[PDB]
Design a protein around this ligand. Sequence first.
Ligand SMILES: CCCCCCCCOCCOCCOCCOCCO
Ligand SMILES: [Ca+2]
Ligand SMILES: [Ca+2]
Ligand SMILES: [Ca+2]
Length: 435
Amino acid sequence: AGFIDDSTLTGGIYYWQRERDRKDLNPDSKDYNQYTTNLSHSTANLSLDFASGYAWDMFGLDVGAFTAIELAESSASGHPNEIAFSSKNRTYDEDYSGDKGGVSLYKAAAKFKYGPVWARAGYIQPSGQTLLAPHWSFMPGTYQGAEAGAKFDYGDAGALSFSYMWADKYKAPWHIEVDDFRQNDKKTRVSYLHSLGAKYDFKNDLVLEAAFGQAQGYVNQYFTKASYKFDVLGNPLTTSYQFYGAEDRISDKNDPNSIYDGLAWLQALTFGYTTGQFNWRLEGTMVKAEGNQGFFLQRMTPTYASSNGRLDVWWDNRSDFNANGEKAVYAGVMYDLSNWNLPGMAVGGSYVYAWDAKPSTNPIYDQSQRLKESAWSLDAMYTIQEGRAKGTLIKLHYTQYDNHTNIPSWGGGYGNIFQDEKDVKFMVIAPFTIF
Ligand SMILES: CCCCCCCCOCCOCCOCCOCCO
Ligand SMILES: [Ca+2]
Ligand SMILES: [Ca+2]
Ligand SMILES: [Ca+2]
């Protein structure tokens, strides 16, 4: 046992091919009503990760890097596509002008263990109980910072986990260099993000989680979750209630750095149910997000790509369904084809219906607007089950998204809503072990 004995060297080959076409309702467009190219690219990633063992069972090191390789990109494809690297190397230099290949050092961390306590420092991903999170493409984003936590297992009485994380820079996986954190104006600095959270597992399928976070001088962020599982008619019903909240520290609602008025939140209820080869999902969300921004963010810095935060609800139906006032219901099914002697293969689909979405409360926007949006998707996926390629994911995802207004994308006070789309994503994720 130790630094070398327990070392691993692993990697990944990743392939992404996407066609996303979006209806253009920009008033002066020559292609008004047409589904023009929004994304059209073919891109690979390659990753390699060294993870040491623990010298003296207390000290180790992880180093990971990845490259992006561009096979094809239409001149009309938008930027950044989040699989290649943005042509701009840091968060706040983003101008949406290009994508490129490159290489990024995405993990470079000292790791520590001392009794029940653990820590990681350097270029790290959040790994404990806080509400800080990386963005995920094929690879995760990278914080410059440190996290420490502990776990106390009380056996029958349950297990407690908690951790604290602090960071002063970040890069999304589409940026090669870390940037600092700033307010909405992309100028006023935010000297750190930090977060504290906890989890208690009662060992009877009840799990409680909670976390608090701050962007220095700017945003307070909240998370709570209760999860439970029990049988309904002989089959497991999994349930969760989730609360996500945020407030800024700029009360003046017309200040350009004010993003929320009072407390903003996203609340969710989820149910999952398995019957034979079918896995069913029924989920719903509701949002309050008064203020200039007009939608809820799980991340504590508002600028695109600038950080991320924990959000357990993911419907893969293109829209975030997170506008001020918006309510949304999701229904989905996946069918395991093992009984057709296609083990590892699954197919499914899903549907979202959302309504009551309101714009930003900034008075320059028409406050009478109420927006509905809906979507459906289809899924086909295979996980290879034997051979050197065991664990490889091959997946095709297809979405039709419908914005039930004529508002041009990102317009009308709906700064996070875009127009109708057809989206086709094909991906291969092939992990491999060197030692
Ligand atoms: C310590 C973990 C607690 C997780 C359970 C959710 C409690 C979060 O409360 C936030 C405020 O919620 C507003 C009230 O909404 C109705 C409550 O929904 C069901 C609560 O289980
Ligand atoms: Ca380019
Ligand atoms: Ca405010
Ligand atoms: Ca429409």
